[PDB]
């Protein structure tokens, strides 16, 4: 019944969004909620923030 | 009042990538008032240059592979991100690269311009492994701020792009890590005053005084706003362009009348007595004068603009 | 002298302005006086019909639209009123005229370039 198959391939890129599951190696699940800028992250005495 | 203002002291550069800069003397409670307020501004909206697009031969898309390379193609994207260029007079430039032979291309290899100051010579781009290879890449450089990686540029603007251009994810911010510490400045009667030691660790492409001087241009713009803040269309056309019948209006422009304001300021009795008017053209003159609301010989104030041309 | 201006406006307006003699009376003068003012100039104006039949005849052969637009584009009354004018002038059916691969000057009235 078929004449021929045409089957194309598409690739994508995907980054951290709200609602993207996130966990360590101990069962500590997490919904990533909010993406904060670098200033309003808490920062140590020597500059490099959390 | 017993006010006081702080001033420039010094700039001590460790290198192009590290420096320190003081500021003194502030009064009580002022050191964190201006101190953190710059740390939130020198990271947020400090403008600088970055890499916007790359176009490159022999490859049609970033997820292919190129012959004669060690690292992959989007690793060249993830190495051309951390380049640092200081453009003096252009918010858009280009640079070309032509390279052959086995050997790692560094930033010295690219063909420069007279006004893009290069910061790092050896920020490693690629690795060549076969001698017959050749490279043509054209690195677009813009100057902006923030982390808009032109993914909104493709999403706010839908121009017809040519096939072959690769879009770079860019961070325009030159400032990386900035912190401060507040020690007591010594004025003999005012022991309460303090200093504002301000550090800075960035890449190149920045003079630090311009960073601090641009901050007060930002703040005092908002700090001003809390102190200071608390004619008929068919009358203005040619007589030929009034859109009338066969011969009623173009007969009027051989009287040199090429504006409708000049029409209403002629005597009707002697305009219809020239040997070119016809006696059924009378009603079209009576049309556009009565439909608009004008009288015979009534003086219009200024019928021409500063543009005055005939045919 | 004066009604020169009627000649090539009529080359341009056999179109959307339906111009009759009373609409041609908008050229300054009366219904009856424009006739003899056009007569001793030309010999032959209501020429207009020829232009309407000539001016419709640009649509048969040189544009691809069918026949029903043509009898109402260039200011004729109806599709029989067109072909009544067509058969009195060109002695053909326009379905026997355009479909024919040959075409020559038998009935098409020339425009007046006096």
């Amino acid at each position: 019944g078929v004449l021929k198959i045409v089957k194309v391939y598409l690739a994508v890129k995907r980054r951290i969004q709200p609602g993207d599951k996130m966990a360590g190696r101990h069962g500590n699940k997490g919904v990533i909620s909010k993406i904060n800028p670098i200033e309003d992250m808490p920062y140590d005495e020597n500059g490099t923030p959390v | 009042t017993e006010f006081l203002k702080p001033r420039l002291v010094d700039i001590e550069q460790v290198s192009s990538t590290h420096a320190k800069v003081t500021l003194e003397p502030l009064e009580r409670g002022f050191g964190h008032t201006l101190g953190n307020a710059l740390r939130r501004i020198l990271l947020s909206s400090m403008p600088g240059c970055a890499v916007t697009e790359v176009e490159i031969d022999g490859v049609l898309h970033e997820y292919s592979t190129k012959e004669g390379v060690q690292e992959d193609i989007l690793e060249i994207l993830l190495n051309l991100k951390g380049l640092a260029v200081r453009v003096q007079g252009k918010d858009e430039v280009i640079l070309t690269l032509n390279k052959s032979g086995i050997g790692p291309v560094t930033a010295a290899d690219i063909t420069h311009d007279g006004d893009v100051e290069i910061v790092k010579p050896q920020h490693v781009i690629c690795h060549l492994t076969d001698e017959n290879a050749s490279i043509s890449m054209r690195i677009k450089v813009q100057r902006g701020r923030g982390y808009v990686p032109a993914s909104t540029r493709i999403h706010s603007e839908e121009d017809e792009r040519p096939i072959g251009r690769l879009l770079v994810d860019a961070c325009y911010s030159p400032v990386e890590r900035i912190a401060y510490n507040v020690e007591a400045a010594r004025v003999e009667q005012r022991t309460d005053l303090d200093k504002l030691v301000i550090e800075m660790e960035t890449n190149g492409t920045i003079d630090p005084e311009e960073a601090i001087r641009r901050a007060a241009t930002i703040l005092a713009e908002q700090l001003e706003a809390f102190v200071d803040l608390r004619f008929d269309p068919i009358l203005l056309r040619p007589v030929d362009d009034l859109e009338l019948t066969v011969r009623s209006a173009n007969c009027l422009k051989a009287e040199a009348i090429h504006y409708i304001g000049d029409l209403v300021q002629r005597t009707e009795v002697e305009l219809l007595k020239t040997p070119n008017l016809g006696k059924k053209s009378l009603t079209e003159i009576k049309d556009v004068l009565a439909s608009r609301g004008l009288s015979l010989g009534m003086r219009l104030e200024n019928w021409p603009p500063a543009s005055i041309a005939d045919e | 002298g004066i009604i020169r201006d009627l000649l090539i406006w009529l080359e341009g307006h056999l179109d959307q302005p339906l111009s009759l003699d009373n609409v041609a009376a908008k050229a300054g003068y009366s219904k009856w006086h424009l006739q003899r003012m056009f007569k001793d100039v030309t010999g032959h104006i209501g020429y207009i019909r020829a232009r309407r039949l000539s001016k419709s005849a640009v649509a048969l052969r040189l544009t691809a639209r069918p026949i029903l637009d043509i009898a109402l584009q260039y200011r004729f009354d109806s599709q029989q009123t067109f072909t009544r004018a067509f058969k009195k002038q060109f002695a053909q059916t326009p379905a026997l005229y355009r479909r024919s691969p040959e075409w020559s000057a038998f009935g098409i009235r020339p425009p007046l370039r006096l």
Side-chain angles (χ1 to χ4, degrees), chain A, chain B, chain C residues 1-46 48 50-114:
Chain A
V2 196
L3 284 188
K4 71 196 293 182
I5 286 170
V6 44
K7 178 257 300 171
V8 307
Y9 281 157
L10 83 142
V12 80
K13 206 195 296 187
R14 272 175 152 110
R15 289 165 294 116
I16 285 309
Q17 284 201 357
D20 262 0
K21 208 171 168 211
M22 213 68 200
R25 265 167 313 177
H26 298 296
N28 50 4
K29 281 174 286 174
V31 180
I32 286 183
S33 157
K34 202 199 162 177
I35 307 174
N36 218 16
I38 326 291
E39 318 95 4
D40 40 355
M41 298 301 308
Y43 70 106
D44 53 359
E45 56 173 317
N46 213 355
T48 170
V50 171
Chain B
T1 172
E2 313 308 310
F3 55 86
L4 206 148
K5 316 172 295 278
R7 277 84 41 93
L8 187 72
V9 182
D10 46 0
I11 289 164
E12 40 275 10
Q13 298 172 54
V14 159
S15 66
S16 67
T17 195
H18 203 239
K20 293 200 209 198
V21 47
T22 46
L23 169 57
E24 78 172 352
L26 294 145
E27 293 183 0
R28 39 168 175 98
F30 275 68
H32 310 319
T33 315
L34 292 169
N36 189 75
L38 295 201
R39 194 200 93 84
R40 287 186 42 82
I41 286 177
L42 270 76
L43 292 166
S44 185
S45 304
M46 267 289 305
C49 320
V51 165
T52 317
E53 293 192 357
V54 299
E55 196 177 356
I56 176 169
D57 67 291
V59 289
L60 320 175
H61 58 106
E62 40 173 349
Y63 307 88
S64 78
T65 170
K66 201 199 144 179
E67 168 149 351
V69 206
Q70 283 190 359
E71 309 98 303
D72 272 342
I73 293 181
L74 77 155
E75 202 172 318
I76 313 170
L77 263 295
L78 291 191
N79 280 123
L80 277 179
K81 194 263 165 191
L83 206 68
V85 282
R86 189 183 316 217
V87 199
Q88 295 167 352
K90 258 71 66 183
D91 293 350
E92 151 175 355
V93 275
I94 75 169
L95 302 164
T96 51
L97 165 65
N98 300 269
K99 188 47 179 66
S100 173
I102 303 180
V105 46
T106 70
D109 270 326
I110 60 174
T111 79
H112 66 297
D113 198 359
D115 49 359
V116 282
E117 179 154 335
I118 320 160
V119 167
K120 282 207 59 56
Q122 45 188 355
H123 171 79
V124 161
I125 315 292
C126 291
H127 267 100
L128 283 159
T129 178
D130 294 315
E131 65 267 6
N132 299 341
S134 285
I135 299 101
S136 192
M137 62 181 53
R138 302 193 295 274
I139 42 171
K140 271 298 287 289
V141 164
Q142 286 179 34
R143 161 189 278 154
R145 67 189 191 273
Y147 185 57
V148 273
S151 186
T152 324
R153 175 180 296 278
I154 186 174
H155 277 147
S156 73
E157 190 178 14
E158 314 305 328
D159 288 336
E160 294 90 356
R161 282 183 183 91
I163 292 92
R165 294 172 72 106
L166 316 183
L167 186 50
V168 192
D169 290 321
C171 201
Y172 296 94
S173 201
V175 194
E176 292 270 330
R177 187 184 57 78
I178 159 176
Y180 65 96
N181 287 311
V182 175
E183 301 94 326
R186 187 184 163 182
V187 159
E188 303 96 13
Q189 82 285 352
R190 302 308 305 267
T191 77
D192 206 6
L193 305 200
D194 309 86
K195 86 180 69 163
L196 189 54
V197 165
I198 295 174
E199 292 209 38
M200 190 163 302
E201 184 217 21
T202 81
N203 62 322
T205 75
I206 276 299
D207 177 48
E209 177 156 343
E210 182 195 33
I212 312 162
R213 201 182 262 123
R214 276 180 196 184
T217 68
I218 287 277
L219 265 164
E221 189 132 22
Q222 285 90 241
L223 265 295
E224 268 183 15
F226 292 159
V227 176
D228 297 335
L229 182 53
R230 270 90 180 276
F231 45 88
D232 201 286
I234 65 180
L235 189 60
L236 281 200
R237 289 175 83 174
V239 182
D240 183 80
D241 296 89
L242 191 55
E243 279 90 9
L244 282 173
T245 174
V246 190
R247 199 275 305 151
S248 285
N250 65 287
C251 73
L252 304 166
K253 72 162 153 41
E255 205 65 35
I257 309 166
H258 65 298
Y259 284 108
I260 327 287
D262 208 290
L263 287 173
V264 310
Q265 288 161 127
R266 189 145 171 101
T267 171
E268 188 186 4
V269 196
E270 316 296 323
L271 177 57
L272 264 288
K273 276 179 72 175
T274 181
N276 199 226
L277 262 293
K279 269 67 63 185
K280 299 312 151 311
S281 309
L282 191 70
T283 323
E284 286 87 8
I285 289 181
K286 288 175 179 292
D287 199 319
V288 288
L289 264 69
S291 42
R292 164 166 45 244
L294 296 186
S295 305
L296 204 162
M298 203 275 292
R299 302 296 103 188
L300 294 190
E301 278 78 19
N302 174 48
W303 45 280
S307 162
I308 43 170
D310 211 341
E311 42 191 331
Chain C
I2 281 171
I3 323 159
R4 170 68 184 261
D5 203 72
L6 203 47
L7 191 43
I8 321 292
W9 176 283
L10 274 167
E11 189 87 11
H13 288 270
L14 277 198
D15 219 357
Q16 300 93 18
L18 177 51
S19 276
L20 198 142
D21 190 23
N22 317 327
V23 197
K26 300 182 172 177
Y29 296 115
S30 165
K31 157 143 202 182
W32 288 268
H33 187 36
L34 289 169
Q35 295 178 356
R36 288 89 37 84
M37 279 192 295
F38 196 79
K39 172 194 305 182
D40 48 8
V41 176
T42 67
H44 299 97
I45 194 41
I48 297 172
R51 317 315 315 305
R52 231 149 236 191
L53 268 179
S54 69
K55 279 283 178 177
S56 69
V58 310
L60 286 151
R61 209 155 304 270
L62 294 182
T63 61
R65 316 292 317 115
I67 202 162
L68 304 190
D69 161 65
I70 304 186
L72 298 177
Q73 183 92 38
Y74 290 87
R75 286 316 165 165
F76 278 134
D77 206 295
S78 174
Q79 201 77 42
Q80 184 36 241
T81 323
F82 177 75
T83 52
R84 216 185 282 104
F86 204 97
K87 192 65 178 187
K88 290 315 160 56
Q89 177 152 338
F90 319 107
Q92 291 201 44
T93 307
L96 295 175
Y97 195 30
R98 68 186 300 175
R99 162 220 285 181
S100 299
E102 208 274 334
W103 43 279
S104 298
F106 163 61
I108 317 106
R109 160 75 171 95
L112 272 179
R113 301 270 203 170
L114 280 164

